[PDB]
């Protein structure tokens, strides 16, 4: 049950990191472009 709990935590962190990285990448593109117009 511990193994299953850790595997679910891995999956959850990956999904949330995916959302965060998508946001970070959207903002990087906005910042990079606004800053070099």
């Amino acid at each position: 049950a511990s193994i299953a709990r850790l595997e679910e935590k891995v999956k959850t962190l990956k999904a949330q990191n995916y959302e965060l990285a998508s946001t970070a990448n959207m903002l990087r593109e906005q910042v990079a472009q606004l800053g070099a117009p």
Partner: protein, 36 residues
């Protein structure tokens, strides 16, 4: 492939989770400044 490996992968993931949150926050400050 083991409890220890899962815990080490979790540690890595949470460090990445932190880094993305911090960078996002820093990008948001830069973005608001880019509105002069």
């Amino acid at each position: 492939a083991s409890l220890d490996e899962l815990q080490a992968e979790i540690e890595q993931l949470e460090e990445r989770n932190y880094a993305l949150r911090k960078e996002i926050e820093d990008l948001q400050k830069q973005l608001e400044k880019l509105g002069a």
